[PDB]
UniProtKB/Swiss-Prot annotation, chain B:
Region of interest (Repeat 2), residue spans: 78-142
Family of this protein: Belongs to the ClpA/ClpB family. ClpC subfamily.
Region annotation (Repeat 1) ranges: 4-69
The protein's name in its UniProt record: Negative regulator of genetic competence ClpC/MecB
Function noted in UniProt: Competence gene repressor; required for cell growth at high temperature. Negative regulator of comK expression. May interact with MecA to negatively regulate comK.
Limits of the Clp R domain: 1-142
Top-level taxonomic group: Bacteria
Natural source organism: Bacillus subtilis (strain 168)
Range within the parent protein: 3 to 152 of 810
From Swiss-Prot, chains C, D:
Residues of the full protein shown: 125 to 218 of 218
Assembly and binders: Homodimer.
Function: Enables the recognition and targeting of unfolded and aggregated proteins to the ClpC protease or to other proteins involved in proteolysis. Acts negatively in the development of competence by binding ComK and recruiting it to the ClpCP protease. When overexpressed, inhibits sporulation. Also involved in Spx degradation by ClpC.
Signal peptide: none
Family of the protein in this entry: Belongs to the MecA family.
Top-rank taxon: Bacteria
Name of the protein in its database record: Adapter protein MecA 1
Organism from which the protein derives: Bacillus subtilis (strain 168)
């Protein structure tokens, strides 16, 4: 049944790539360039868990 | 050598700067010392500057050595003194919890090397060798990083 | 007692959660140091009771860093320059 | 503080490197011991502060020999008596 719920392991992979972009962006500032990357991150995050 | 933070490597190369600039053909520990205080905001640099030894104070003594100098600076490399001091910093960084060794350890390394060129420079400019290492020590350690709690 | 405190935040997602909360007259500077983000709140002035107060909320998402502030400031990396709480909400929301 | 010090050199080329500067105020005699050249600077006409000064330079190219001074003076081998430093530059560099 749960042989990966919707295969949203792929989701998690994205959420990582984000973290990086996001992360590195917050360090440079890259204000809105961290902001939107963050938003893309937590967007992903919840998306994983629901599926 | 072979591992080192910028700050360490930087004080060391700054010695070479002193090689030609003071003409010390091969750069002793005095130039390493100068290196520490001449990078300003290195923990070593800062330390010497606390004790009152600015770039000036050190360099004045240093200039009283070869003093600009054999600017040809035959074998613009380290000396056995300076290479030892560098090695000592490595041990002074093992000691202080820095794997890639920083400025601080090099000032500590000078102290270690208390008959060295730095050391004698410092004993002419007053400043006791252990008060100098003191100042550096008290700006290192007491950390918890890679974590936020447990 | 201290009136400027040095706080450690865990993973960045903790900081997002945090970002949606407080500043309260605190210029504040956010360092990155061994993967974790430190947030240095520097209350211009508060009284000790008041600073411990404000500092509570922050420290719901942070813990109080044992890393002396000049240690962070040197071998860390800037994330946000001295308006960090205010800024992180931008820079971690919308 | 003694006005006379004994410093040790590695490869001869290290001694040579020193030789290319300073022998003023230092009568100096150069000994041979385990392929290292020990160099005895004997500051004549100096004060303690002045010796700590001078001695810096010497030990910039050397390290400070741990040899007891009557041991050096005895069981060494002169390479240069006289003003050793003046002499090493002649006898090794040209």
């Amino acid at each position: 049944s749960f042989t990966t719920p919707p295969n949203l392991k792929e989701l998690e992979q994205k959420l990582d790539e984000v973290r990086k972009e996001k992360d590195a962006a917050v360090q440079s500032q890259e204000f809105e360039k961290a902001a939107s990357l963050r938003d893309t991150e937590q967007r992903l995050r919840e998306q994983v868990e629901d599926t | 050598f072979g591992r080192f933070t910028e700050r360490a490597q930087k004080v060391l190369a700054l010695a070479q700067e002193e090689a030609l600039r003071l003409g010390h053909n091969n750069i002793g520990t005095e130039h390493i010392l100068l290196g520490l205080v001449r990078e300003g905001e290195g923990i070593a640099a800062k330390a010497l500057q606390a004790l009152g030894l600015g770039s000036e104070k050190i360099q004045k003594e240093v200039e009283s050595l070869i003093g600009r100098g054999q600017e040809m600076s035959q074998t613009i490399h380290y000396t056995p003194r300076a290479k030892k001091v560098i090695e000592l910093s490595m041990d002074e960084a093992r000691k202080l919890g820095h794997s890639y060794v920083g400025t601080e350890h090099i000032l500590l390394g000078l102290i270690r090397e208390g008959e060295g060129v730095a050391a004698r420079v410092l004993n002419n400019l007053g400043v006791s060798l252990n008060k100098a290492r003191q100042q550096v020590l008290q700006l290192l350690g007491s950390n918890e990083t890679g974590s936020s709690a447990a | 007692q201290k009136l400027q405190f040095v706080l450690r935040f865990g993973d960045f997602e903790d900081v997002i959660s945090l970002s949606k909360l407080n500043v309260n007259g605190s210029k504040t500077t956010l360092y990155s140091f061994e993967n974790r983000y430190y947030l240095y709140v520097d209350f211009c002035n508060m009284t000790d009771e008041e600073v411990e107060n404000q500092l509570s909320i922050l420290l719901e998402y942070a813990t109080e860093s044992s890393i002396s502030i000049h240690r962070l400031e040197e071998y860390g990396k800037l994330i946000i320059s001295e308006h960090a709480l205010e800024t992180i909400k931008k820079h971690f929301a919308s």
